[PDB]
């Protein structure tokens, strides 16, 4: 998270959209395509919590009591993470009676997402959990346990997936075209105003994450 903030400061300070010939294509690094992003989500936190589906079709829920339930894409294998960080590995078919409510909620959330929501990055060629999230008027901000930070913009449906380990960013535009860039290469070659503006917002969002952990 700290390194992500530094990577973004570096690219933003280079003023990528306002210093001559933009060579954005040359900043593309297809090697740095993320393995994991959030494809779907449901904000039901007024009662239960926030459910999400990862790109591999695995599902997760961050409940209001700060516990997490993670269903792997085989549809049975389960991970549970308590408040104190205690991780438990099991299956739905073998759950203790105590997790009954939470499993039911996950399966409900799973069904809605699978049946009624669009898969983000469905055209991208093919386990972390949700550490934290918040919502603004403009965007939902998703912080995964592998360090990745995703930002989905509500109004135009454009999305950023920020990968601190690769020092990279994947951008999904209004047409659902995806391009993955190395951040230092965006510094080297520049980019359009659209990407530049969302990266400035991204830095502000990472700063909010860092100030609220």
């Amino acid at each position: 998270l700290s390194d992500m903030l530094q990577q973004l400061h570096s690219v933003n300070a280079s003023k990528p959209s306002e210093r001559g010939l933009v060579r954005q294509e040359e900043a593309e690094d297809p090697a740095c395509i993320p393995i994991f992003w959030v494809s779907k989500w449901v904000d039901y936190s007024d009662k239960y919590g926030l459910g999400y589906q990862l790109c591999d079709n695995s599902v997760g829920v961050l409940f209001n009591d700060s516990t997490r339930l993670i269903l792997y894409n085989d549809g049975d294998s389960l991970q549970y993470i308590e408040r104190d960080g205690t991780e438990s590995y099991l299956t739905v078919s073998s759950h203790p009676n105590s997790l009954m409510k939470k499993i039911t909620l996950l399966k409900y959330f799973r069904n809605y997402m699978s049946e009624h929501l669009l898969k983000a990055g469905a055209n991208i060629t093919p386990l972390p959990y949700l550490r934290t999230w918040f919502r603004t008027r403009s965007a939902i901000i998703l912080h995964l346990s592998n360090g990745s930070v995703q930002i989905n913009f509500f109004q135009d449906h454009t999305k950023l997936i920020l990968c601190p380990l690769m020092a990279a960013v994947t951008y999904i535009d209004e047409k659902r075209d995806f391009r993955t860039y190395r951040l230092s290469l965006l510094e080297e070659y520049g980019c359009c105003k659209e990407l530049a503006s969302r990266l400035r917002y991204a830095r502000t969002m990472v700063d909010k994450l860092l100030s609220s952990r």
């Binding site: 989500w41 449901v42 007024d46 989905n152």
Partner: peptide, 6 residues
């Protein structure tokens, strides 16, 4: 009450 793109 809110969700990702339908």
């Amino acid at each position: 009450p809110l969700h990702s793109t339908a």
